[PDB]
């Protein structure tokens, strides 16, 4: 459920800043941020700590 | 998703899947998937030529 | 040179995302108060134009 | 001993198939033309929109309501800066940039 | 150490001289992607 709700609310933030209209530094962050939830969802500590 | 993301099973382990369907070295694709470097993805030859 | 060793840490891996993040915001000037005035009044400008051409 | 529940309840009746109460299907379409069957009561009020298994709002397929209207946002850049400002200001502020603007350019 | 041949070869095959090129060559690995400035490579060994 931790790992299901980091998915769900970077997910629902990437949408807010698209929408808002954000500069691509903040939407980039977000985007790599999204990634990197989904890999430790499916493979914990693979990549990274 | 708002946003598509790589499956971590066919990035990461070695040897890495997605880099020999590409043929991208596993560093080189990290850098991409990660939002750390650029990636052509077309070119056009007729305007440039 | 120092040029050298410089530039060649500006492009590295850098596989941490916090640090990732603070290297590329640490990459801009900071502003004082006239230039934060002269930027709110162009935002201030362009918003009523988009408005008005609407 | 630790004994814990996942809060819910178990019934004992016997799962017959015969003496069932009526049903009726409705139909649901989206915005990207997917369509649903939902199937409701028989003695029962059929909605207008349903949140179907995209989650995706719905319409109705059969013609006769005429419900969505505007529930508009009151809180965008402009209405925060019409707030603060006034319009004779912001008409002075934008001829003031085109008369710079002229001046850089043109001259 | 001018008893070690083993030290005066080391000596002879490192193509680096001088404390500030030591300390670039330190600092380039031991904390990589940080642009090297001049004191905080000097105080790096010394607040490691």
């Given at each position: 459920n931790d790992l299901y709700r980091r998915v769900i609310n970077r997910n629902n933030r990437l949408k807010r800043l698209i929408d808002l209209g954000a500069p691509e530094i903040i939407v980039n962050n977000e985007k790599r941020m999204l990634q990197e939830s989904v890999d430790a969802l499916f493979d914990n500590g693979r990549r990274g700590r | 998703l708002a946003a598509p993301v790589t499956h971590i099973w066919y990035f990461?382990?070695?040897?890495?899947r997605l880099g020999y369907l590409l043929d991208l070295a596993p560093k080189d694709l990290e850098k991409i998937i990660y939002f750390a470097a650029y990636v052509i993805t077309s070119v056009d030859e007729e305007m440039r030529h | 040179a120092l040029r050298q060793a410089r530039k060649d840490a500006e492009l590295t891996?850098?596989?941490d995302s916090v640090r990732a993040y603070l290297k590329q915001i640490g990459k801009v000037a900071l502003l004082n108060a006239e230039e934060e005035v002269e930027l709110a009044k162009r935002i201030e400008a362009g918003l009523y134009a988009t408005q008005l051409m609407t | 001993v630790l004994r814990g529940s996942r809060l819910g309840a178990v019934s004992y009746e016997t799962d017959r198939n015969h003496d069932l109460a009526p049903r009726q299907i409705a139909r649901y379409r989206t915005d990207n033309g997917e369509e649903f069957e939902v199937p409701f009561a028989d003695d029962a009020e059929i909605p207008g929109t349903w949140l179907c298994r995209n989650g995706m709002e719905g319409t109705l397929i059969e013609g006769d309501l005429p419900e969505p209207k505007k529930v508009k946002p009151p809180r965008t850049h402009w209405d925060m800066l019409l707030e603060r400002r006034s319009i004779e200001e912001l008409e002075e502020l934008l001829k003031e940039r085109l008369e710079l603007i002229r001046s850089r350019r043109r001259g | 150490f001018g008893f070690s041949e083993i030290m005066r070869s080391t000596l002879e095959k490192d193509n680096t001289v001088g404390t500030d090129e030591a300390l670039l060559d330190i600092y380039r690995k031991l904390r990589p992607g940080e642009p090297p400035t001049k004191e905080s490579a000097q105080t790096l060994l010394e607040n490691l």
């Amino acid at each position: 459920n931790d790992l299901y709700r980091r998915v769900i609310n970077r997910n629902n933030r990437l949408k807010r800043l698209i929408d808002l209209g954000a500069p691509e530094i903040i939407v980039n962050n977000e985007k790599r941020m999204l990634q990197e939830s989904v890999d430790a969802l499916f493979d914990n500590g693979r990549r990274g700590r | 998703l708002a946003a598509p993301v790589t499956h971590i099973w066919y990035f990461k382990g070695v040897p890495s899947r997605l880099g020999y369907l590409l043929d991208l070295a596993p560093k080189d694709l990290e850098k991409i998937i990660y939002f750390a470097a650029y990636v052509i993805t077309s070119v056009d030859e007729e305007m440039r030529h | 040179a120092l040029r050298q060793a410089r530039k060649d840490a500006e492009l590295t891996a850098s596989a941490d995302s916090v640090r990732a993040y603070l290297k590329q915001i640490g990459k801009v000037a900071l502003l004082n108060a006239e230039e934060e005035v002269e930027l709110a009044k162009r935002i201030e400008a362009g918003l009523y134009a988009t408005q008005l051409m609407t | 001993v630790l004994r814990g529940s996942r809060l819910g309840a178990v019934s004992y009746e016997t799962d017959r198939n015969h003496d069932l109460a009526p049903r009726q299907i409705a139909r649901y379409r989206t915005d990207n033309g997917e369509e649903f069957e939902v199937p409701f009561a028989d003695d029962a009020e059929i909605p207008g929109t349903w949140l179907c298994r995209n989650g995706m709002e719905g319409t109705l397929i059969e013609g006769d309501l005429p419900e969505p209207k505007k529930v508009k946002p009151p809180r965008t850049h402009w209405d925060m800066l019409l707030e603060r400002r006034s319009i004779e200001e912001l008409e002075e502020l934008l001829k003031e940039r085109l008369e710079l603007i002229r001046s850089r350019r043109r001259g | 150490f001018g008893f070690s041949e083993i030290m005066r070869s080391t000596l002879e095959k490192d193509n680096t001289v001088g404390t500030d090129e030591a300390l670039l060559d330190i600092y380039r690995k031991l904390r990589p992607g940080e642009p090297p400035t001049k004191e905080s490579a000097q105080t790096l060994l010394e607040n490691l």
